[PDB]
Amino acid sequence: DAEFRHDSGYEVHHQK
């Protein structure tokens, strides 16, 4: 769970 949230967070934080 946390891993996915963190990954998605980092990813989306960058690319937008």
Give the angle 10-1-12 at the CA atoms, nearest 5°. Answer: 20
Residue in the structure block whose two tokens are 């934080």? 13
SS3 track for the chain? CHHHHHHHHHHHHHCC
The Cα 12–Cα 1 span in angstroms is 17
The Cα 3–Cα 16 span in angstroms is 20
Residue in the structure block whose two tokens are 């963190």? 6
Tell whether 10 is in a known binding site.
yes
Tell whether 7 is in a known binding site.
no
Q: Two tokens at 12?
A: 């989306």
Question: What is the number of residues in the chain?
Answer: 16
CA-based nearest residue to 12, from 4, 2, 1: 4
The Cα 16–Cα 13 span in angstroms is 7
Tell whether 2 is in a known binding site.
no
Tell whether 14 is in a known binding site.
yes
